[PDB]
Structures are given as C-alpha cells and as structure tokens.
Design an enzyme around this catalytic site. Structure first.
Site, PDB file in Angstrom:
ATOM      1  N   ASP A 180       6.784  -6.586   4.640  1.00 45.85           N
ATOM      2  CA  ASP A 180       7.370  -6.947   5.926  1.00 45.85           C
ATOM      3  C   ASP A 180       7.749  -8.423   5.867  1.00 45.85           C
ATOM      4  O   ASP A 180       6.935  -9.270   5.487  1.00 45.85           O
ATOM      5  CB  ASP A 180       6.372  -6.732   7.070  1.00 45.85           C
ATOM      6  CG  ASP A 180       6.110  -5.262   7.359  1.00 45.85           C
ATOM      7  OD1 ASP A 180       5.383  -4.971   8.331  1.00 45.85           O
ATOM      8  OD2 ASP A 180       6.625  -4.399   6.618  1.00 45.85           O
TER       9      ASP A 180
ATOM     10  N   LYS B 218      12.636  -1.346  11.762  1.00 46.15           N
ATOM     11  CA  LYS B 218      11.906  -0.490  12.685  1.00 46.15           C
ATOM     12  C   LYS B 218      12.664  -0.180  13.971  1.00 46.15           C
ATOM     13  O   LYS B 218      13.467  -0.983  14.450  1.00 46.15           O
ATOM     14  CB  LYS B 218      10.579  -1.147  13.073  1.00 46.15           C
ATOM     15  CG  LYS B 218       9.561  -1.278  11.957  1.00 46.15           C
ATOM     16  CD  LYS B 218       8.251  -1.834  12.510  1.00 46.15           C
ATOM     17  CE  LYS B 218       7.085  -1.612  11.558  1.00 46.15           C
ATOM     18  NZ  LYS B 218       7.180  -2.442  10.333  1.00 46.15           N
TER      19      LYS B 218
ATOM     20  N   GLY C  29      -1.826  -4.348  11.156  1.00 46.60           N
ATOM     21  CA  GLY C  29      -2.232  -5.556  11.846  1.00 46.60           C
ATOM     22  C   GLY C  29      -3.711  -5.881  11.792  1.00 46.60           C
ATOM     23  O   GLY C  29      -4.097  -7.015  12.077  1.00 46.60           O
TER      24      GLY C  29
ATOM     25  N   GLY D  61      -3.678  -2.165   6.824  1.00 47.37           N
ATOM     26  CA  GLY D  61      -4.938  -2.664   6.305  1.00 47.37           C
ATOM     27  C   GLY D  61      -4.941  -3.213   4.890  1.00 47.37           C
ATOM     28  O   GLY D  61      -5.916  -3.856   4.495  1.00 47.37           O
TER      29      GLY D  61
ATOM     30  N   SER E 212       1.068  -7.880   7.329  1.00 46.16           N
ATOM     31  CA  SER E 212       0.353  -9.117   7.608  1.00 46.16           C
ATOM     32  C   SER E 212      -0.408  -9.637   6.391  1.00 46.16           C
ATOM     33  O   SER E 212      -0.501 -10.847   6.180  1.00 46.16           O
ATOM     34  CB  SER E 212      -0.621  -8.883   8.763  1.00 46.16           C
ATOM     35  OG  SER E 212       0.030  -8.217   9.833  1.00 46.16           O
TER      36      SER E 212
END
Ligand SMILES: [Cl-]
Ligand SMILES: [Cl-]
Ligand SMILES: [Cl-]
Ligand SMILES: [Cl-]
Ligand SMILES: [Cl-]
Ligand SMILES: [Cl-]
Ligand SMILES: [Cl-]
Ligand SMILES: [Cl-]
Ligand SMILES: [Cl-]
Lengths: 298, 307, 298
Positions: free
Chosen positions: C9, C65, C137, C235, C257
């Site tokens: 991302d 997205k 996240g 995760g 993330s």
C-alpha cells in the site's frame, strides 16, 4: 444353512410332513405357533422330545427356538442336534441385557432384526442368518415391510458414507452394550457413565465392540447388503405377501401362522412356496392364489 | 535430538533464568549466578499496549556473544516461522510464550520436528500434557508475568500438584478417560468450520485435525504422556515456576512447592538494586530450605517491583 | 493479474517508487493506509488524480480500493485504467445488502474473505482474486492466521464430501442473498420468507444462486483450494509474518501499514519481499530480519 426358500413353523409330525410335501426348505419346530403364543404366559424352548420327533419325520433341516439370552436352552438344542437355533423374541426374553454369544457355538443361529443397528449387533455376536421381522402372529405383512424398508434405506445411506463416517455409526450402535454397566454404576451412587476400556460383554470392552461392529458395517457397505443370509418374517399370509418380500430384497421367507392357521394348509403352503420361487412372475402368483380358501384372520 | 533436548534442560534445573534486554543486563545476570538468560526487547511488565513479537535476531546474537551461559528467546504462540528463525540463529532454547501476542488462535507450534528444545507455559495438567505431547522439552508453570504477584504462580503449581496426585490414584482405564477429555481442545477448529458450513458442530474421531494426527491418535498420544506422569508422580520434563517472582522468599516458596527452578523477568531489573537483587534470588533458589540464608540475602535489598 | 509476490500500500509517488525498488509485485494506491483509516470518519475511493500519479510513477501493476457495493466508484477506477480494483471492507461500506456484481466489469477485482462461504460468494459474484483477511491496520498477524486456518480446514472438509453434500453447503451459503427480500416482506406485514424462484440479486433467483455457488464449490473440491489466486492480508508486519502466511498456503501477501509505519520502510520492504520468496529458507528469513529497526506498533 438355508440360503433360499420357505421356512415353515410346524407343531407336530403331520404338519412337518405337510411342510416338506409342500416344498419348504426347512421347518421350525415349536409347540405353539406365534399367533397362539400371544393367550399364553411364559413361552419357552419346546420339549426336546417333540423336536426330535419332527427331526426324524422329515429329511429337510429342522430349526428350534430358544429364549433371548438363554444360553443353556441353546446348548440343549445344540446337544440334541437341531440344524439351526432361532434366538427369537417370539418367546419370553430370558436375559434383559444381552443376547447369547453365538460365536462360541457350533450350530448356526438365526436372529431377528428390526433395523440395521440390530442386524449388525446380532451378526457381530455370531448370527449366521438374520430375519428382518416386524411381529409374528399378526398375519399383517406391514410389519415385515416396514423393517425391510428401514433395512434397505439404511444400507443405501451407509454406502454413501466414508469409512470414517461409518466408524461414527459403529460407535453409535455399540452404546446399547453398556446399559448394564451404566445402570450398575448409578445404583452404586455414581454417574451413569462407562470407560471405553472396561469389559462389558464377553470380555470385550466398549472400544473393542465398536471395532467389531465397524468391521461388520464395512462389509455391509462393500456388499450393499447384510453379510449373512437375510429372510423376511412376520405377517406373510398369502402367496402375494411372500412374493412382495422377495421383490423387496429378501433371500427367503419364514411362515408360521399363515399356513396352519388357514383353511387349506397344504394347498396354501404349496402356493406360498411357488410364489416365493416365481416371485417375479405375476401370472404364476395369480394362478396359485386362485381358490386357496380362507387365510388366517390376523 | 530427542535425548539432547532433555539433556540441555536437565543442566538448567535448580537454577534461575533471567530476562535481559541488553549486554549489560545479560552480564549482570551472569555475574549474579544465573544458569541462563532469556533475551527480549522488553520485559513482561513493560510488554503490558501494542503487539509483542519476536526480538530482532541482531539483539539476540549480541546477547549470545556477550555471555558464556546459554541464551533463550521467545516466539509468539503458533508462530512456526519466528521459531525457525530463532533456531537458525542458534539460540539454546525457544520459549513459545503467552507473554507475547499469540499468532495462531487454534494451534501451538509442532515442536517435535525442531532440533532446538522448547519451553512452554502451562496453567494446569491438561495444558502441560498437550504442550509436552506437542514436543515441549521443558514446562514453566506460568502465572502472571509483569505483576510481581506470586499468587498466580502459586495457584497453578497448586493445581498441577493436586491433579498429578489425583492421577496417581487412577487405573489406566481412568487415565485414558482423562486423556480423551484433554484431547477435545484440538477439535475446536474442525467443529467451528463444520458449523460455518451449516452442519452440526461435531467431529469424527478418525479425521485429521492437527499435524496430520486424528483425534483418536491424539488421545493415545496424550494417554501415553499421562501414563508417564502417573508413573513418575510429576511431569516427565523439567518444570520451572514463572510469573510474579519478585523477592528471594518468592523464589524459595516456589522451590518448596516443587518447582525445579524459577524464571525471573521484571522482578530483577525493575527493582532498585538489580545485581544485588539477582544475587539474592539465586542464593535463595539454591538454598530454599535455609531460612537463615533466605533472611540474610533479603536484608537491605532496597525497593522491589509492584503491579 | 498478479499471481505471487508482495502487494504494498502506497500513499504517494515516493512510497510507490520505494515499493517498486523493494521488489513489490504491485502497489495499492490509497490516500491513507489502513492503520490511519481506523481516526477517520467515512473512508472513500481515493482521488483519481493521486491514483494516476502513482500509475505514472511505477512500471508494476497498480490497484485501488472502492467501497463495498459502490458500483460507480468502481466504474471510475476502471475508466482511469487501474490494473485491479479492491472492493475492500477497509473503506466504509456503501451498500449494506450486496457487493458489486463484478462479472460485468472488464477490470479484475480482488475481494476479502473471512471464510469459505465468503470466498465462494465473492468468486461467484466475479472476484478474480481473494485476499483471506482478518483485519488490516492492527499489525497483528493472528487475524490473517485465523482466517487462513478456517479457509484451509473448510476446504479439507469439503473434499471429503459427496457432490450431494456439497450442494447442501451451497444451499446454506446462498441464504445470505435473500436477507433484503425477507426484510422487505416483513416490512410489508408478511412472513420473513422468500420463494426460491423469485429474483433477488442481479436477476438471479435463489435457486440459480445456489447452482452458481455449487459450481464454484465443485471446483474448490476438485482443486483442493480456491479456483482463483489467494493472498493473505492484514497484520503482516515482519519478514517472519510473511513467511508464516506462505507456509500456511497463501500465494502471496498484502502489506499496508507494516512497511510505511515502520522505522526503515525501504529496508523492511526488501526483507518482506525476500522472506516471501524464500519462505522455506529459515537462514534467509533470519538474515533479512537482522537490524530492521522498529516495526509498526499495532
Ligand atoms: Cl439390540
Ligand atoms: Cl467417530
Ligand atoms: Cl474412556
Ligand atoms: Cl440384506
Ligand atoms: Cl491448551
Ligand atoms: Cl512437575
Ligand atoms: Cl458475504
Ligand atoms: Cl419456493
Ligand atoms: Cl486457496
């Protein structure tokens, strides 16, 4: 052991000879047919003398009944030399917890069964033949039909299962053997439970019984039928009834009251024998049904 | 290894394993008399806001090079890859610990296929037996890491001892019944999945559910470990106490309760005088049955931890 | 479409270039990574201008997205030319009853799935790729593991079933589509029931949807896995986490993330890329994990 044909119940030398004359494959020696047994208090094994007379009177195989779980009655029938012993629910049950351990005997046994669970347990115990019965003495064929239907549908469903699922069925069927142990523990002030590795029937633990039933079920699954001879019984009163059971898959039929409780025993006996042999020939079943006379009331 | 795994564990028994976060602490631990150290980035008391994972391999290697005693490291429960990493860098023992954030909600690592030995936590006999069958070479009857409250460690050792005492009064058939009960935990995933597919939440005992083993085979495995426990009157592997050991008296208490040794995390470096404190806990562990020694090393230790 | 590797991302040209430099197989263009999205009210499709800049900045595929059920947001992403559209639950759901009917589009879609039921429904709707997710996240891998475990165990059980039993599963999974129809009938004063031959989703009746899911399930049964590419997501924060998912059966991984929320993004990105490629080589995963710096909090 008999593999096909009609087994008839006889109460004397004249009836046995008629049965043999009619074409029966074997006879069942007893003092009173099912219909009469049910006026009657305690129904037991017949007098050995009567059974021996019937044995001498005919050339075909002779069977005799013994009470459920009555080991000594069975040992007696074996000693006088009957060809097959029928541990029947027609007589008054002698042991409320267990059936005879048939594997120890030399003479073969025939046992009743209302469904697959009963058949498998009976076969594991040693039965060499199963009679899918509903209720003798009634003259109502619906009994035998209900149970043959239940038997066929259960075997059809068993064939669609994996071996692991069949094991699950075997585990369910084995529970009946632990009823005594559970009742006893409860009577001793403890939970009505059992450990699968404790002896409960003939030295066999629950776990070993499960494996035994499982093996029988695997054979049922492989064959698409029971691994022993299977005759229909109870309610067969007409040639059409006998033919109906054969079309439902039976290997043969048992007839008790239907013949000797009818107007023309010898005539009706021949007709049922013919219908059983020619069960897929409507014209023959029709012809042998003409002018048979009064059938048993029921 | 098989024999080598338990071989390493028997050499740490009777001692104190200390958690260290750097070279200085590891060294302090060694001069204090620790039998081994547990390398980690943050002690359990600090661990308890985010996700606690395996420590950077570099930090663990630095610690391995700083001391001559054996070094252990933690990996999240069920995290096979973290464990494989720790084994590759050469740690002496891996601790699949609940102090770190669990990675697999259904299963713990299948420790038997590893070469390096594992130490696992256990709150009761059932957990110890399942961890041992999975391959644990050492058990730590855990409590509540980071609280400095010994009650948790005591509760679980009490539960462990009482269960083992009751197990010894049972026939083998009765023990099998216990093994059967203990094995049910492994079928949770299978039952949940079956329910999700619109069917009864049940399972067949001959279907594979863990590492290729069926429920039936798992029960036999647990049964065999239980027989060993019954024969020995204790766990078949080294059993250390872990949780809230914060004072020399706490360590001595666990030893009197039957522990083979103790793990100390926050109790040493979260106190006033680390080195002195560590030395006192080591001596109290070695002389747990010597009130005068325990009292002596407890005098003037300074403030301890809390929680 | 991507078949393996790491999808990262990115929120700007610098991050996309870093992602491409690190060896990502593709990038996910969005204004805010999952971790930050969850301060934040309504999360929507990103500005087309930002997505186009990222598309120009790199040579690898670019994904974007769109909200669940937001057909026009999807048509927009398709018009500007993104390589793959991710109908994600990370953004605020737009249609509470249905997901986009993906088969009508030309651009391929990737959809999330928590279990087999969701995967099958998403695939039937048209998804060309599934991402077995738990919750992005968090930086906690337990999410992805729980769902991959659920996915694997369900497919393993499905393989032991007969086609008839699989149909039963398909029938169960189809019920979710009739929720709207049932709610509406109830609102009109009638029983919350539906007739299987009435249209409920894109002109398809419940009966037709069941047949559609059944066909997908038969392919799952035949392959022993999903019939489309399946990546793990949510995760993944360390190289070991990526390697763990690959050992659990994933074809690849999504990282949001975990990289740009860590201390050394480019370094950690290369390491995760390496661990994913060499997931069965402990020494390599170990080596790339050395001195990576602080990972995302979570
Ligand atoms: Cl029975
Ligand atoms: Cl089972
Ligand atoms: Cl048991
Ligand atoms: Cl049969
Ligand atoms: Cl557990
Ligand atoms: Cl112990
Ligand atoms: Cl859904
Ligand atoms: Cl309908
Ligand atoms: Cl898959």
């Amino acid at each position: 052991m008999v593999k096909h044909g009609v087994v008839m119940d006889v109460t004397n030398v004249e009836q046995a000879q008629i049965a043999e004359e009619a074409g029966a494959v074997a006879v069942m020696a007893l003092e009173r047919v099912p219909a009469d047994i049910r006026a009657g208090g305690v129904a037991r094994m017949s007098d050995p003398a009567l059974i021996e007379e019937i044995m001498d009177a005919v050339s075909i195989p002779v069977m005799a009944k013994c009470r459920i779980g009555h080991t000594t009655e069975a040992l007696v029938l074996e000693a006088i030399g009957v060809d097959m012993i029928d541990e029947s629910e027609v007589l008054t049950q002698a042991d409320p917890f267990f059936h005879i351990y048939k594997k120890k005997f030399n003479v073969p046994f025939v046992c009743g069964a209302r469904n697959l669970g009963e058949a498998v347990r009976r076969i594991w115990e040693g039965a060499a033949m199963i009679r899918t019965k509903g209720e003798a003495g009634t003259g109502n064929i619906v009994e035998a039909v209900r149970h043959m239907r239940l038997m066929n549908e259960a075997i059809a469903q068993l064939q669609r299962m994996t071996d692991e699922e069949v094991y699950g069925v075997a585990k369910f069927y084995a529970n009946r053997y632990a009823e005594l142990a559970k009742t006893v523990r409860e009577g001793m002030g403890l939970p009505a439970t059992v450990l699968e590795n404790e002896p409960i029937y003939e030295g066999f633990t629950l776990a070993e019984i499960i494996d035994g039933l499982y093996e029988v079920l695997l054979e049922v699954k492989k064959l698409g039928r029971l691994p022993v001879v299977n005759f229909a019984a109870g309610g067969v009163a007409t040639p059409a009834d006998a033919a109906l059971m054969m079309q439902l898959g039976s290997d043969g039929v048992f007839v008790g009251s239907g013949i000797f409780k009818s107007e023309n025993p010898l005539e009706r006996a021949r007709a049922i024998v013919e219908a059983t042999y020619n069960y897929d020939k409507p014209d023959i079943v029709a012809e042998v049904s003409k002018n048979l006379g009064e059938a048993m009331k029921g």
